[PDB]
Design a protein around this ligand. Structure first.
Ligand SMILES: CCCCCCCC/C=C\CCCCCCCC(=O)OC[C@H](O)CO
Ligand SMILES: CCCCCCCC/C=C\CCCCCCCC(=O)OC[C@H](O)CO
Ligand SMILES: CCCCCCCC/C=C\CCCCCCCC(=O)OC[C@H](O)CO
Ligand SMILES: CCCCCCCC/C=C\CCCCCCCC(=O)OC[C@H](O)CO
Ligand SMILES: CCCCCCCC/C=C\CCCCCCCC(=O)OC[C@H](O)CO
Ligand SMILES: CCCCCCCC/C=C\CCCCCCCC(=O)OC[C@H](O)CO
Ligand SMILES: CCCCCCCC/C=C\CCCCCCCC(=O)OC[C@H](O)CO
Ligand SMILES: CCCCCCCC/C=C\CCCCCCCC(=O)OC[C@H](O)CO
Ligand SMILES: [Zn+2]
Length: 347
């Protein structure tokens, strides 16, 4: 299967061809499959519930991005089936664009859900239900498929996700009509949805100055400033900063040094949202310029394409690494291996 391998410009040879492209794809295919499979076995096999479902969905969306990315890696690894390249780069580029819309929308629905919880706190549970959230999921899956369905009916190229394959990078051409359609009906709406919700959510929060929770890095005790530690002289309504240095963890006795601020779940979702929408921003700028024929650059086409695909890997990393309990799981894991390493070494 022939590939478009523009990196290492003019330095490639019969043994060196498609090496920088192959490391990027093979790493991302691995990091996205592994990174989401860990998240769905730890948290998706008990938070704010509606968001827990949008996050669960975009976990399977991001996993199947990397599962699809097994196609380029195996073609780049000289494994082939007796099927035209024009077809496998047409199907893959469709599947990825759709999955990329499913995750992009999932982050737009979380943003609205958190908007509605904060703006209509009386009505929130009366607007959101287990049937409404379930019909909202399938409408993302239907809408995403239908914005990238024209590619199968001669409207043009819906992205550069298959431009690693030769046929898609030189034979299929993006049409400004099709690109404008996608941008206006998918990229522009989600971007404005998440810009309006997170602007107003932080507009409201900036007035209401809530006191920060802190967790014990050793055992996982949460100092909740609304409760305090009344047994040990700590009045409720005292921030962690105000407790004297003398104070110690009630569950294990470690000092105020061993306590990290518990990050707010909204702020985690704003980070996942800003990383995701910023990692595919270069790719939409290139997608607009090339469709407008103001620019053609296969290297800029490849970097922005895989910089976007990489946000299927950042999603599970921001989510698990912003959570205090997952982190503790890893520190207890290292110790389990260490004490067993001290033990297996007793010989
Ligand atoms: C680490 C990434 C592992 C993948 C390294 C790719 C090595 C390779 O097989 O490159 C293809 C070759 O250049 C084609 O002639
Ligand atoms: C790669 C996947 C690796 C995921 C390994 C998770 C298994 C595990 O240790 O889970 C224990 C925990 O109690 C469950 O959340
Ligand atoms: C926003 C709409 C911009 C033009 C839409 C358009 O040209 O429609 C093409 C589409 O692929 C028809 O199926
Ligand atoms: C909103 C979608 C806008 C749909 C725009 C449809 C344009 C179209 O279908 O093209 C006409 C046909 O090719 C005859 O010239
Ligand atoms: C393109 C590069 C991607 C850089 C993303 C920018 C970013 O991560 O901003 C998030 C913000 O810091 C969250 O609080
Ligand atoms: C990836 C597109 C821009 C990402 C911006 C956010 C991340 C910043 C990281 C690197 C920027 C510097 C690397 C830019 C490499 C562009 C390749 C290029 O411009 O090609 C040069 C030459 O013209 C070919 O013919
Ligand atoms: C590749 C460029 C990506 C640069 C920004 C990625 C954001 C990221 O991975 O940071 C999350 C952090 O690990 C959670 O604690
Ligand atoms: C490539 C990126 C690797 C970063 C991995 C873990 C950092 C977060 C671990 C939780 C914070 C404790 C820091 C630590 O040293 O823990 C070792 C951990 O067991 C190792 O998996
Ligand atoms: Zn403790």
């Amino acid at each position: 299967e022939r590939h478009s391998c523009p990196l290492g410009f003019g330095h490639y040879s019969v043994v060196d061809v498609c090496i920088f492209e192959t490391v990027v794809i093979v790493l991302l295919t691995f990091l996205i499959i592994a990174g989401n499979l860990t998240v769905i076995f730890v948290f998706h096999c008990l938070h704010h519930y509606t968001t827990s479902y949008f996050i669960q969905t975009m976990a399977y969306a991001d996993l199947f991005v990397g599962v699809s990315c097994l196609v380029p890696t195996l073609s780049l690894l000289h494994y082939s089936t007796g099927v035209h390249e024009s077809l496998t780069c047409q199907v893959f580029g469709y599947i990825i664009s759709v999955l990329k819309s499913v995750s992009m929308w999932c982050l737009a629905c979380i943003s609205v859900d958190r908007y509605l919880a904060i703006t209509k706190p009386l009505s929130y549970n009366q607007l959101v239900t287990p049937c409404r959230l379930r019909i909202c999921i399938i409408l993302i899956w239907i809408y995403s498929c239908l914005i990238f369905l024209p590619s199968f009916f001669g409207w043009g190229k819906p992205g550069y996700h298959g431009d690693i394959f030769e046929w898609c990078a030189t034979s299929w051409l993006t049409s400004a009509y099709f690109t404008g359609f996608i941008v206006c009906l998918l990229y522009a709406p989600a971007a404005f949805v998440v810009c309006f919700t997170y602007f107003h959510i932080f507009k409201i929060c900036r007035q209401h100055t809530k006191m920060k929770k802190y967790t014990c890095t050793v055992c996982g005790y949460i100092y909740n400033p609304e409760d305090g530690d009344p047994d040990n002289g700590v009045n409720p309504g005292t921030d962690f900063k105000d407790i004297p240095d003398d104070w110690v963890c009630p569950l294990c006795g470690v000092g105020k040094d061993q306590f990290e601020e518990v990050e707010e779940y909204l702020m985690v979702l704003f980070r996942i949202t800003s990383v995701f929408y910023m990692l595919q921003l270069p790719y939409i700028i290139y997608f607009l310029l090339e469709s407008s024929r103001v620019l053609d650059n296969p290297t800029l086409s490849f970097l922005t394409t895989w910089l976007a695909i990489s946000n299927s890997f950042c999603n599970p990393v921001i989510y698990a690494l912003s959570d205090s309990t997952f982190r503790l799981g890893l520190r207890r894991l290292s110790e389990t291996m260490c004490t067993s390493c001290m033990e297996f070494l007793e010989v």
